[PDB]
Chain A
């Protein structure tokens, strides 16, 4: 029974730079349609059969662009929202590159045409010049700012005027304003020329002076959008309510259905990585991608999944091929217009959520157990900022682990580990505003009382002076039998990192002054003392010890007596050897626009960052600097402030250098206190 063709499905993302107006445009959509959300659209003139629009509203911030990446990958088409005043933003370029990576056929909506400085054609030219795109206006704005009244449809060559009294639910077709007729004819010819380029037949008609029909123009522009050759540009502004309705008609006319998109690539679970495809059909084996996990207070884990092939029912044991885990599907609803119609028939093209999946993560493939496939995996970027989180109480201690676990499950770009040296829980994320939201959820949804600090710098200990002839004599001949042990050691610094063990032991015992059986106990006594340095109780590194002189007693000498002597000798020698506190240094790489370059280093200089050099790149300059871990905290948001949000840094542990005398001494004193 032919019900609603999958060719009527529009799986679309609304994507924009932070602060551009995209969910208000979506709220306008829901109002006009009748209502991840499903909506139904029949056209602003009711000229279309009912189309199913599944909308994913993607975050504007770059701290949550990981969600945008997941969405873009799982979606068919996109609506790119631009501010008429601000135009193409640095963050728009990031989202534009992500949509290019996934080859998402997309259109453009120039919103905020009611604000001061609104300029449609300026934004069209910025899409061309900054994004390297081919923008083709479908519409022209009638007026600007407070004088914005409507739009010209360049396909129909008519003005669209929306009724302000019904919030734009009704519209009239008018003749083009007399001051715009010349400009409308110019852009109509540019639109027809852009349509004619879609095929040799349409190019011959156009060059022959034959007028293209509205159906040929629409079909030709659709083909090129699907090919990602052009971006169709629409305009309009809500509040007075304009554009959205005609942008939704452009979604039907020009954006892909699930059958217009290439088959999804995957790998067979045969151990040979055999390539396979899944076509957008109900008659194919079931395959779906889990793309979002949300924690719900009432139903538990919601796993959002997009079906690409086949059909599944609410309550169907499928196979999580990625995690090799048979997962019985839970309760599955669907946002049928306003209601949440529980669907027991998730067909190809549909987006739904399952309740109570246990071993499913974002990026997992859910498939038919009799036809295993792994759909292509999501690569998750490495976290760029880390902070220490400490529980206030012991109730908060266990609760913290639980809360952070849930947050790491729903958001892979969020990492949590315990630092083995500090025993602090370290949390890491895709920016500090990202970490701020994570902390807020932890101390609200889960209400876990925690302090936010900085990852403790891994302080080390070493000497800066050879000391010779250091006597250690454990002579405890008391309490029954005596315990005699006597060693003489030299202590000397090693070059930093010259020994992968951080420690050298030289046995230079001559004359059997110490029996060879006790020499391992002396070394073990030193190695235990290396774990807790005599200066501040940090591990001692980059040190050599030569045992060359010693003495035993035939009855009273013990293995651990010589280990006690070794510790005495070590503690006395270490204090004489001018002990110092060490530091880690981090190799930092910053990618920035050439005009923002200066600011980056100004701050890095205050952060004790020894700028090694620079590699002027295409974006601008790739500056390299040696910056202490202590000064590499809170840099994500600071960089975002200096560079207006167009810079990305990386950092790696470089080497164990010497902390500046001031820094080292200050910490030594604080630790002693």
Chain B
């Protein structure tokens, strides 16, 4: 990685291809290639399941080369994956969207502790509790 001047964390997908049009955001007042991105991700795509946008960064070095910063499928889209109900954001308190057990996140928190980095696997569970209610979820065992 490098300084936060060649920092945009991005890439909703790899099969939608070009990360320059709407699908892939950013690529503004920065300057870098676009097809020069997904080829290293092509040796990296087939471990991630689709429907799970992974955050990676366009970190450009001082010598024009750029690869990505791998951080695993996160909190938000796994509750659209492991529960089975998508984004719907805005309503945590209006009508019931879905309740999630305690251990349903802990089994994928070991996968998500390679995505989230504060300290630990258990410690990142209460921030999977975060964006779920912003998507509209409720959580109780």
In which size bucket is the chain A interface? under 10
- Smallest CB separation, B26 vs chain A (Å): 9
Q: Does B15 reach chain A (CB closer than 8 Å)?
A: no
CB-CB contacts of A590-616 with B at 8 A, as 1s and 0s? 000011011000000000000001111
Structural contact, A621 and B28, CB atoms closer than 8 A: yes
Closest to B19 in A: A616
- Smallest CB separation, A623 vs chain B (Å): 10
Structural contact, B20 and A615, CB atoms closer than 8 A: yes
Please report the C-alpha to C-alpha distance between residue A598 and residue B29 in the assembled complex, in whole angstroms.
Answer: 9
Q: Does B82 reach chain A (CB closer than 8 Å)?
A: no
For B22, give its contact among A594, A597, A613 (CB under 8 Å).
A613
Closest to B31 in A: A594
Please report the C-alpha to C-alpha distance between residue A594 and residue B22 in the assembled complex, in whole angstroms.
Answer: 16
Measured between beta carbons, the chain A residues less than 8 angstroms from B21 are: 613-615
Measured between beta carbons, the chain A residues less than 8 angstroms from B30 are: 594
Measured between beta carbons, the chain A residues less than 8 angstroms from B27 are: 614, 616, 621
- Smallest CB separation, A624 vs chain B (Å): 9
Measured between beta carbons, the chain B residues less than 8 angstroms from A597 are: 28-29
For A614, give its contact among B28, B31, B34 (CB under 8 Å).
B28
- Docked complex: B75-89 residues within 8 A CB-CB of A: none
Please report the C-alpha to C-alpha distance between residue A608 and residue B51 in the assembled complex, in whole angstroms.
Answer: 35
Please report the C-alpha to C-alpha distance between residue A616 and residue B21 in the assembled complex, in whole angstroms.
Answer: 7
Structural contact, A616 and B34, CB atoms closer than 8 A: yes
Please report the C-alpha to C-alpha distance between residue A615 and residue B20 in the assembled complex, in whole angstroms.
Answer: 6
Structural contact, A595 and B29, CB atoms closer than 8 A: yes
Measured between beta carbons, the chain A residues less than 8 angstroms from B29 are: 594-595, 597-598
CB-CB contacts of B34-56 with A at 8 A, as 1s and 0s? 10000000000000000000000
Measured between beta carbons, the chain A residues less than 8 angstroms from B31 are: 594
Please report the C-alpha to C-alpha distance between residue A621 and residue B26 in the assembled complex, in whole angstroms.
Answer: 11
CB-CB contacts of B3-28 with A at 8 A, as 1s and 0s? 00000000000000010111000011
Q: Is the interface of B mostly helix, strand, loop or mixed?
A: loop
Please report the C-alpha to C-alpha distance between residue A597 and residue B31 in the assembled complex, in whole angstroms.
Answer: 12
Measured between beta carbons, the chain B residues less than 8 angstroms from A598 are: 29
Please report the C-alpha to C-alpha distance between residue A598 and residue B28 in the assembled complex, in whole angstroms.
Answer: 10
Please report the C-alpha to C-alpha distance between residue A595 and residue B28 in the assembled complex, in whole angstroms.
Answer: 9
Please report the C-alpha to C-alpha distance between residue A613 and residue B22 in the assembled complex, in whole angstroms.
Answer: 6
Measured between beta carbons, the chain B residues less than 8 angstroms from A594 are: 28-31
Measured between beta carbons, the chain B residues less than 8 angstroms from A615 are: 18, 20-21
Please report the C-alpha to C-alpha distance between residue A391 and residue B28 in the assembled complex, in whole angstroms.
Answer: 47
- Smallest CB separation, A583 vs chain B (Å): 25
Closest to B21 in A: A615
Interface centre among A595, A613, A614, A616 (most CB of B within 10 A): A616
Measured between beta carbons, the chain B residues less than 8 angstroms from A613 are: 21-22
Measured between beta carbons, the chain B residues less than 8 angstroms from A595 are: 29
- Smallest CB separation, B21 vs chain A (Å): 5
- Smallest CB separation, A590 vs chain B (Å): 14
Measured between beta carbons, the chain B residues less than 8 angstroms from A614 are: 20-22, 27-28
Please report the C-alpha to C-alpha distance between residue A158 and residue B34 in the assembled complex, in whole angstroms.
Answer: 50
Please report the C-alpha to C-alpha distance between residue A615 and residue B23 in the assembled complex, in whole angstroms.
Answer: 10
CB-CB contacts of A575-601 with B at 8 A, as 1s and 0s? 000000000000000000011011000
- Smallest CB separation, B20 vs chain A (Å): 4
Please report the C-alpha to C-alpha distance between residue A165 and residue B21 in the assembled complex, in whole angstroms.
Answer: 63
Measured between beta carbons, the chain B residues less than 8 angstroms from A616 are: 20, 27-28, 34
- Smallest CB separation, B62 vs chain A (Å): 18
- Smallest CB separation, B29 vs chain A (Å): 6
Please report the C-alpha to C-alpha distance between residue A231 and residue B22 in the assembled complex, in whole angstroms.
Answer: 41
Please report the C-alpha to C-alpha distance between residue A613 and residue B28 in the assembled complex, in whole angstroms.
Answer: 12
Please report the C-alpha to C-alpha distance between residue A601 and residue B39 in the assembled complex, in whole angstroms.
Answer: 32
Measured between beta carbons, the chain A residues less than 8 angstroms from B20 are: 614-616
CB-CB contacts of B103-114 with A at 8 A, as 1s and 0s? 000000000000
Closest to B27 in A: A616
- Smallest CB separation, B130 vs chain A (Å): 30
CB-CB contacts of A609-631 with B at 8 A, as 1s and 0s? 00001111000010000000000
Closest to B32 in A: A616
Please report the C-alpha to C-alpha distance between residue A646 and residue B104 in the assembled complex, in whole angstroms.
Answer: 55
24 example contacts (A-B, Cβ-Cβ < 8 A) are as follows A594-B28, A594-B29, A594-B30, A594-B31, A595-B29, A597-B28, A597-B29, A598-B29, A613-B21, A613-B22, A614-B20, A614-B21, A614-B22, A614-B27, A614-B28, A615-B18, A615-B20, A615-B21, A616-B20, A616-B27, A616-B28, A616-B34, A621-B27, A621-B28
3 tightest A-B contacts by CB?
A616-B27, A613-B22, A616-B20
A residues with a Cβ closer than 8 A to B are: 594-595, 597-598, 613-616, 621
- Known contacts A614-B27, A621-B27; 10 additional CB pairs below 8 A are A594-B29, A595-B29, A597-B28, A614-B20, A614-B28, A615-B18, A615-B21, A616-B20, A616-B27, A621-B28
